[PDB]
Amino acid sequence: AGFKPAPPAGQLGAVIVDPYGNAPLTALVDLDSHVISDVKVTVHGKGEKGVEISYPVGQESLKTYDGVPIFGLYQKFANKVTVEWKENGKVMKDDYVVHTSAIVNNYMDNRSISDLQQTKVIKVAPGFEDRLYLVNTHTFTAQGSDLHWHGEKDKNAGILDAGPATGALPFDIAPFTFIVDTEGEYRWWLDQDTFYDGRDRDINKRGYLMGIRETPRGTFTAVQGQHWYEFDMMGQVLEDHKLPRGFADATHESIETPNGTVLLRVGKSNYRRDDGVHVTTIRDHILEVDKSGRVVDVWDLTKILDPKRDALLGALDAGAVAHAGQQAKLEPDTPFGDALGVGPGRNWAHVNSIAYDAKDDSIILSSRHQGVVKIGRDKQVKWILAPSKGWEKPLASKLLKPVDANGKPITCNENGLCENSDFDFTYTQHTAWISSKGTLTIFDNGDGRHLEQPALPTMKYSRFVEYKIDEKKGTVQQVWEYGKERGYDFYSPITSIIEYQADRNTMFGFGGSIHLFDVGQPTVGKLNEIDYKTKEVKVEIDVLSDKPNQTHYRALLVRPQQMFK
Amino acid sequence: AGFKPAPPAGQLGAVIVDPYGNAPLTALVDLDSHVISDVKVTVHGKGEKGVEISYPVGQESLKTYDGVPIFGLYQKFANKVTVEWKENGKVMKDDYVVHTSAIVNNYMDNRSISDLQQTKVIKVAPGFEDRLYLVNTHTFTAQGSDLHWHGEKDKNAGILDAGPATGALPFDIAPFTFIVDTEGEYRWWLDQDTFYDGRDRDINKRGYLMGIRETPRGTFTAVQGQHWYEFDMMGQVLEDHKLPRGFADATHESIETPNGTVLLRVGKSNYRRDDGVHVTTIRDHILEVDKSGRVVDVWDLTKILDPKRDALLGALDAGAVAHAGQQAKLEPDTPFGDALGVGPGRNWAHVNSIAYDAKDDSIILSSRHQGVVKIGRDKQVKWILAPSKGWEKPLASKLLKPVDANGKPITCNENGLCENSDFDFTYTQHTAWISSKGTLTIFDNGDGRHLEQPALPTMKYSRFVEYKIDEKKGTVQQVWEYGKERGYDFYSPITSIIEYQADRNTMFGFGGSIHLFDVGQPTVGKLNEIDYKTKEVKVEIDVLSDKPNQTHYRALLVRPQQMFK
Amino acid sequence: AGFKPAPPAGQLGAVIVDPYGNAPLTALVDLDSHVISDVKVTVHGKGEKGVEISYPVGQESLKTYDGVPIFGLYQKFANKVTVEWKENGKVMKDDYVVHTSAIVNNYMDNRSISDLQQTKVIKVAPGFEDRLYLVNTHTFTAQGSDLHWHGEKDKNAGILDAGPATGALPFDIAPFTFIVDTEGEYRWWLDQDTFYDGRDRDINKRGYLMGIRETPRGTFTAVQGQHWYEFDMMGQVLEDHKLPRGFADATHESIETPNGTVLLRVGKSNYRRDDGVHVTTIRDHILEVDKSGRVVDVWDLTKILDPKRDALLGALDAGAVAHAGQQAKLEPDTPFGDALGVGPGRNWAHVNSIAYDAKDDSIILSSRHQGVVKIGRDKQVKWILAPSKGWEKPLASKLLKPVDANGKPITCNENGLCENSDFDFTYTQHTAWISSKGTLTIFDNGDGRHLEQPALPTMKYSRFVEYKIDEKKGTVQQVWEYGKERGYDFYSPITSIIEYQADRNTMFGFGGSIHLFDVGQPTVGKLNEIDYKTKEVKVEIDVLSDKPNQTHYRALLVRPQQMFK
Ligand SMILES: O=[N+]([O-])c1ccc(O)cc1
Ligand SMILES: O=[N+]([O-])c1ccc(O)cc1
Numbered sequence A, B, C: 001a002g003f004k005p006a007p008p009a010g011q012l013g014a015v016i017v018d019p020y021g022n023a024p025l026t027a028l029v030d031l032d033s034h035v036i037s038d039v040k041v042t043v044h045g046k047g048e049k050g051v052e053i054s055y056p057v058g059q060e061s062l063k064t065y066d067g068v069p070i071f072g073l074y075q076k077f078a079n080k081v082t083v084e085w086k087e088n089g090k091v092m093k094d095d096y097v098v099h100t101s102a103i104v105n106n107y108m109d110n111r112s113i114s115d116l117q118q119t120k121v122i123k124v125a126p127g128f129e130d131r132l133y134l135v136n137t138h139t140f141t142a143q144g145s146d147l148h149w150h151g152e153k154d155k156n157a158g159i160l161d162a163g164p165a166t167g168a169l170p171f172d173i174a175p176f177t178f179i180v181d182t183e184g185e186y187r188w189w190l191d192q193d194t195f196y197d198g199r200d201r202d203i204n205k206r207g208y209l210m211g212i213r214e215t216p217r218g219t220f221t222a223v224q225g226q227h228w229y230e231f232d233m234m235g236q237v238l239e240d241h242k243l244p245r246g247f248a249d250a251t252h253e254s255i256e257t258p259n260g261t262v263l264l265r266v267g268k269s270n271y272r273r274d275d276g277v278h279v280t281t282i283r284d285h286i287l288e289v290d291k292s293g294r295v296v297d298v299w300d301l302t303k304i305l306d307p308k309r310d311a312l313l314g315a316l317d318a319g320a321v322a323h324a325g326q327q328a329k330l331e332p333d334t335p336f337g338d339a340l341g342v343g344p345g346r347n348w349a350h351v352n353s354i355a356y357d358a359k360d361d362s363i364i365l366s367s368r369h370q371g372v373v374k375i376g377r378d379k380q381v382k383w384i385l386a387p388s389k390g391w392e393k394p395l396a397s398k399l400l401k402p403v404d405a406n407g408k409p410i411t412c413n414e415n416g417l418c419e420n421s422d423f424d425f426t427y428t429q430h431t432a433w434i435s436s437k438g439t440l441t442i443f444d445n446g447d448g449r450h451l452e453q454p455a456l457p458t459m460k461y462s463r464f465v466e467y468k469i470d471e472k473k474g475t476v477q478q479v480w481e482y483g484k485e486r487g488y489d490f491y492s493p494i495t496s497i498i499e500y501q502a503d504r505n506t507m508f509g510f511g512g513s514i515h516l517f518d519v520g521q522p523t524v525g526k527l528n529e530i531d532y533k534t535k536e537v538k539v540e541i542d543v544l545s546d547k548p549n550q551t552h553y554r555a556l557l558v559r560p561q562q563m564f565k
């Protein structure tokens, strides 16, 4: 006779590059039956200023891979890796030279600037040299949206007419998934073919890969289209689940809870409206699923929130999917679909993030088009963070009331413009998460800020904002903000994320759509860590899209020492 | 438009036959956005003596299926189905006629008797008419074993010779998976294509489907070759995991623990023997895996038990594992593979069942070729139930001591033949499980009984046996047996299972290979429930293989009221 | 909403990179409904000495791709492409900048020298700057041979023994498929995933990709494992066929005939020997298949030739699959398999090439281990080119008789050593093809030359040889040879190919295993064009394997002007 397997590299087994076939900048030292412990891997920096990646490897990981996982390699390079372990009581060490191949972008056309996304290091404060950022971004396919769910024909529709479309199947794009270091070097790549295949028409491999979130095992969950997934940093696909049969179009978020369930954001397919028309709803249902893929619970936001509230919907930039700048004019006859509009079957909610509150078994949601809400297990709204306009009772009564640091009311109008105050609500926001501090962090994008469009486009800004909410009193306090004073070059109309980092007291942030509207120019995704105390920029690194006017979604601050438990 | 969906059947949605495509005797009533509770389904008996199937359906199931699951239909029949629920405070009911199609056996040749396996009802006591039994059996493929793992050429092999085989990839067969009622009617069918494709050479769809065991959710786990699965009674494949890369050939058992992990019985691929030869080991590794498919723990039994103990291995009938009746003659040069013999790389252990003891976080194993053992989390042998011959210390010290009802020693020779006692050990046994009564139940097949083959071939018998084990005192008491008087006609040389049933105080049993050796005759799988108090037969039902000399593996007593939580 | 398709690049449609997903150095100009003709593509050289690629594109091709195919790009480059056409009677032209991504080797481990195979230009005579060579080579997988066909157990086999293996499933390797120009630049890449997947165990995607041959449509056929294929230079898979059910292990060759059939080299699975043992035969059956994949005819070489002739088998180097140099010692008990040996079920023939003779509807075959034969449609041997030793009558009588240029006998012994002559037969040869001149060209590797091994290994040589055969007279004349005087650095123990090129009167050659035995060093594949008249080297380019001691198979001289008819 046959062909023999790769022989052992040093004192353990062979060193296999990309063992699972989905992560070309990873390798695996085969255990070859050796019994080892206290394992440590070091991938050495490339060149003078190269960043070292170092981490321990737990027993579960050794057993699962039947080997030592090597993460952090450079592409097209003779990587220098050192592995240390204990065996038979003796301290042991190998040095390996691990050659890798190239990263490939499988989705290129005449719009392509080049094959890969360009990185630009702007600032790296001392003590932040080690940081790694996983970038959850995407690259247009050549055909664009090619598929639609079939809906139910309207009684007001023409007789001869073919049936209409429904839902959001066209929300489909190729993934571009990498880890960048503080030298702007790619230190990880998820093969696009892992989950996606834009050239075939198997809907099982279609959609928009999003909601990459760490699990308690140091692995990650993600959603794409009609499936949700779990994978690890070796590129192993640990779970692949079809959505339960009543739901469709999972986007924006997936998060594992402490109870072993996963919270997902979906639409309801064959949702029967009161007028008896069936639609796939848009971005307005939350599932709680177990690791069998079964449904533990479901929140139907069309019966919990108010799908008729157009206070923010009517104030939005129509160019946040040609018609950029233009404030959106809602129409009463907008066909059902992924279109700005009120009511089930239209994009009335656009929920884009989820946070689980273990304290009361509730969920905090970010509704791009309505605000931020806590919904209980009981399916009742517990609080709302939003300008007060448009909210009828009983919901109006759940609105949180702004207060200062002494606890005294702040006066704001129904558009969320406050007086004599830095306090402002959030507008078309993302990532309404619970920080390790005990507060709510939000990325406040700021489109439709104060429920209008400004005179000039350049007048828009985004903020990293933090709130202290007292649920008993029903008060909200703004306790931290950053970015308002950075102007249009810090403005992300869409996507984006923040997360408080306690290890170094920074606010991590990724603005995913800076300069989205500069026709013909790469879009900018900006990674930041901002010192929480001083507001000094500790890290700033820009990612530039590989095609013009191509947004990014999110980024994560990833830690090698958690990757392989 | 195109083609409309099926319209609603009654007062809910359409009634969809076999929604997942894997269970043709199931249907689903679509929720069509109705909000319902107190759901109960009744599938009416066919004809005068027809068995009725009735069960409640929980919220998670309604949510997961987006509908009411209909279980228990007859093939090719106008089934009469009644669904009852509450909706808007009001008691509701619909009556449905659910036409079903045929059960298909996709694996037939000149050996086939007919397409399906025949049933023969022997006895059904009053009060046992409702009982349903899931039969885990199999049917030969036209080509037989077509594939081998490649191993490592041995230094004693011919210079010119191709490399040898290793492992147990030939342990491959089509499944035949059904539920039988006490009228002998098929009331469920798992499509053979669910997990298996014997005509293609995709090893992902090969193996021997076994270890069908219920989970805490009313669903089931199973193993087939290089994957493990979870499925439900609607035929929904809930999990599908590849085995971790270090392991191969999962057979015989899979059982979920209270900790949400699954225990599996595998081999180790690329196992480096002391002589430096690499083999895939046989049926001698235990995995604990999580629902991410990750390895939580492993027990390497080649370092835990004694792979050179041939006390039982040498006493076996060659015919099991038409050289039947012939006592196995072990050879020092038996080539590595699925072959009777000592050492890592041969079938020295053939472990065929697992039980988790949550009291001390240990595992109880049935080794067909050595006995029954408890092994701790700490990888130490806690006890052995086996004849004393062949055991060296440290392990001999772990042998449990036979005692009577007053705790006085029973006297047994090294072959396990006891004096003046009903006590006997188990030989080539199966399903060493923990009963609800706090005892150890075992199917004592009885091949190589008292460590020899008998004077004449038919001088063999099987037993349902139960033991009480005092682990502190190191003693074992036989507290119940059955079948020793039923002779060769109740002898299953292989496979089989028992399980105590607390609800009706019976011992359930399935003897899977009665008359295996009757050349040209169908093999008998005998389902039994034996009254624990009186030893009276409450149920006896025979299943006959659809080709001669074709073993069954196991059966389960299934309960519809647990199926859809 | 949706995402729009790539917009038009210039005056036709978008320019799509790698439209089919299998050829990353190709692109397609979408026709966007334009009606065009007289199409011409030019990919401009990169840098000062860069080679231009230019070709016409036929109407069939425009219609098939619905666009203009762009072949010849460089990796990771802003390629400059010019497209010219006629439309509405007007001459038209576009210049495009076509960015490409990287080539990836998905199969790397500690043996890897680097990711790609290194090229070394040695000689490019004036007028040969434009030449392109498709290299059919391979790269070891990390696991090596992992799978075996299961065979039939021997009556002389041990009782307890698992069954044996049979056939040649382990003949399995990752492909490395590229076109090189005369600057040593990669100008085409077939994605390894097109046909192969070494990490999965789907045998449908396993084997050894070989027999890449041009079709009358300017496309190519190839075999891998249990399938045969057709593909074009855009990476489109045009045919994928399973082998007919009675055959297995297709290797070495595929060639389309003028009758629309394809000639393949296979083994027979479940071949019943006279002793009643069933085997998969090795490399000794020819199929003629149509484009439906049906069997038009079959030549069973075990009943046509002599499977017992060991004249050459006994003279071979055992190191041509550790035991290199050593002359092979045939044994009477060599287990059946891909092992040197006599009889059906062993590697007695090793047929490695096929040529169809349309003049008499016969096939010329290269038997590595027996010589070169013509076999008629009638299944009768028409002639044999081989040393005379070992050939019994009736076959001995078919041996061709050596003659000089006047037509007078050359005296040679039974080992093929001739006297006073440059004439020599071929030994372990390849590619016995019909040239455009009307002669038989062979690559004469020269292992076991004159039916022995020499005193010293370095004494071996390879030849490009040509013969003029008169079938009526039964004479063979050596009319051209090259390479004997180039010594060990031109010696290919295995693989390799020649083909006469009439356009420039050269003999093209690819020696695929130069330095195979230099342990630890890359293997050398040498591309040559040798002037037929002067014997001057017009082209010489070396390809170095990416792992040590990793042979190449073949290479093709490819012509862009034929690629897109
Ligand atoms: O247009 N886009 O790519 C978008 C728009 C909105 C969104 O939430 C994500 C992506
Ligand atoms: O032959 N068989 O099918 C068998 C043999 C052994 C076993 O444990 C299960 C099934």
Ligand SMILES: O=[N+]([O-])c1ccc(O)cc1
Pocket (backbone or CB within 6 Å): C320, C321, C352, C494, C495, C551
């Ligand atoms: O060892 N090898 O790789 C080989 C040997 C012989 C052959 O015909 C092709 C490949």
